[PDB]
A paper describes a structure:
YP_001813558.1 and its homologs (dimeric dUTPases, MazG proteins and HisE-encoded phosphoribosyl ATP pyrophosphohydrolases) form a superfamily of all-α-helical NTP pyrophosphatases. The α-helical NTP pyrophos­phatases share a highly conserved four-helix bundle, one face of which forms the active site, while the other participates in oligomer assembly. Nucleoside triphosphate pyrophosphatases (or pyrophospho­hydrolases; NTPases) perform the important function of hydrolyzing the α–β phosphodiester bond of nucleoside triphosphates (NTPs) and are often involved in removing noncanonical nucleotide triphos­phates to prevent their incorporation into DNA or RNA. dUTP pyrophosphatase (dUTPase; EC 3.6.1.23) catalyzes the hydrolysis of dUTP to dUMP and pyrophosphate. Here, we report the crystal structure of NTPase YP_001813558.1 from the extremophile Exiguobacterium sibiricum 255-15 (PF09934, DUF2166), which was originally isolated from the Siberian permafrost.
The crystal structure of a putative NTPase, YP_001813558.1 from Exiguo­bacterium sibiricum 255-15 (PF09934, DUF2166) was determined to 1.78 Å resolution. However, in YP_001813558.1, an unexpected intertwined swapping of two of the helices that compose the conserved helix bundle results in a ‘linked dimer’ that has not previously been observed for this family. The structure reveals an interesting variant of the all-α-helical NTP pyrophosphatase fold family that contains an unusual intertwined swapping of helical segments, resulting in an obligatory dimer that cannot dissociate without unfolding of the monomers. This novel ‘linked dimer’ defines a new subfamily of the α-helical NTP pyrophosphatase fold and is distinct from other previously observed domain-swapped dimers. Size-exclusion chromatography combined with static light scattering confirmed that the dimer is the major oligomeric state in solution. A surface area of 5104 Å2 per monomer is buried upon dimer formation. Divalent cations, preferably magnesium, are essential for NTPase activity. Interestingly, although the YP_001813558.1 active site assembles quite differently from those of the other NTPases, the putative metal-binding sites in all three proteins are absolutely conserved, except for a one-residue offset of Asp95 in YP_001813558.1. Furthermore, the active-site residues that are involved in sugar binding of the NTPs are also conserved when compared with other α-helical NTPases, but those that recognize the nucleotide bases are not conserved, suggesting a different substrate specificity. The corresponding residues in YP_001813558.1 are Val10, His14 and His19; His14 N∊2 is hydrogen bonded to the O2 atom of a 1,2-ethanediol molecule in the ligand-binding site. The corresponding pyrophosphate-recognition loop in YP_001813558.1 is located between H5 and H6.
Residue numbers in the entry:
A (entry chain A), B (entry chain A): 2 to 170
Write the structure that this text describes.
């Protein structure tokens, strides 16, 4: 039933040449900034836009978010910084686990089971291999590109939501 | 081996009287803002602070994050808003699934298996029941309070990181 989330993303990383550590290793700060940004693009911006009915709502929600973000930074500025690489790894792991917990709570509040949705995203991601079985990388920024004939996940994700609505009716 | 993440948080929500939907239901915007904020407090602020060695690093990372956040909002402002409740649910589910995927990728980049860490957080959360088997709620803000004798997760989470480092050595 439940997907092996970590092994599935680990697999995506190997297949498409994203970073992966075989031994626990603190994530370098410049790389962490990227990951934090990508995560929030989805968990904050897309989530809030898709929760909004107009520009006025959406902007008020973003500003409220920004104020909470700023309060959290101000609180963190008063806390001492890690002094070893192990300390940085431990604090990252702690933060990533709570973040995972909150994401999961948002699924609970939405009444959506995440496993089948994650499975759709995983399969579509893996289907980005070209017809030679190799990833397609664009010369600008090495972005992984979609091959000709690739079926996008969005409509299936939507059909999965409707399926769950029907199951729980 | 792998925890049932969704069922474990669903359980935490029932036990401690947080919201939960039995049928798939779009999350109201004011509630989504809260969840987005809590998620980013961990995935962005705590994660970046624990990735930093000093105030100068940390502030540069936060500003870089904010610039990416602002670019994403500007892009989203040009996209049409959902016009039904089902549309809002579908877009939230989509966003929450990608966010989950990125969190998982951060575990991959750190080389940390999330399951055992999540298990420690889950168990500590569940152990917040008082000695009558009931949650303790503070009159200010109904915050769930820790009972006398509660063992905090942080040191165990750290010991778990060291255990994984040892296993992968």
């Amino acid at each position: 039933k439940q997907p092996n989330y970590y092994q599935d993303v680990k697999q995506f990383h190997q297949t498409f040449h994203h970073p992966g550590a075989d031994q626990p290793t603190a994530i370098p700060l410049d790389r962490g900034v990227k990951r934090a940004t990508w995560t929030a693009e989805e968990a904050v911006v897309e989530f809030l836009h898709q929760s909004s009915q107009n520009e006025t709502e959406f902007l008020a929600a973003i500003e409220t978010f920004k104020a909470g973000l700023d309060q959290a930074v101000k609180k963190s500025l008063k806390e001492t910084y890690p002094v070893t690489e192990v300390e940085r790894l431990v604090g990252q792991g702690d933060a990533l686990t709570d973040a995972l917990y909150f994401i999961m709570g948002s699924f609970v509040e939405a009444g959506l089971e995440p496993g089948p949705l994650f499975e759709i995203v995983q399969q579509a991601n893996m289907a980005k291999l070209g017809p030679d079985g190799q990833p397609i990388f664009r010369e600008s920024d090495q972005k992984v590109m979609k091959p000709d004939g690739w079926l996008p996940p969005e409509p299936q994700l939507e059909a999965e939501v409707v399926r769950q609505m029907k199951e729980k009716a």
